[PDB]
Amino acid sequence: GQFRVIGPGHPIRALVGDEAELPCRISPGKNATGMEVGWYRSSRVVHLYRNGKDQDAEQAPEYRGRTELLKESIGEGKVALRIQNVRFSDEGGYTCFFRDHSYQEEAAVELKVEDPFYWINPGR
Secondary structure: OOOEEEOOOOOEEEEOOOOEEEEEEEEOOOOOOOOEEEEEEOOOEEEEEEOOEEOHHHOOOOOOOOEEEEOOOHHHOEEEEEEOOOOHHHOEEEEEEEEEOOEEEEEEEEEEEEOOOOOOOOOO
16 A cells, blocks of 8 residues: 556557657655566566666567666656557557565556558558
8 A cells, every 4th residue: 555556547649660658657656766667568578677777688579679768757756668669569558567675556558559651562
């Protein structure tokens, strides 16, 4: 009962090739700089932050060099996962979590993907 984790509450929409930012915050708001904060696929680790820095060695391959965790507001308990070069396999559910020692809470976030160039390279 220390805190709950809340997402945007509605799907984030992105076009193929765009960057997409998925937000998550702890409530009540408090400093999350010292917590483990992660994102996984709804499990496959999309991005993980712990001990003050992104843990590159702990994320999956389909996301290496393709993610960022925006931490400008982490001192207020807010973060956003930025996925670069969105593609259809990125569509769907994500789980964001915040862990403070033995306590962990999470939220579900959805990404919807539209291909603005759906008409290219037909017939093969």
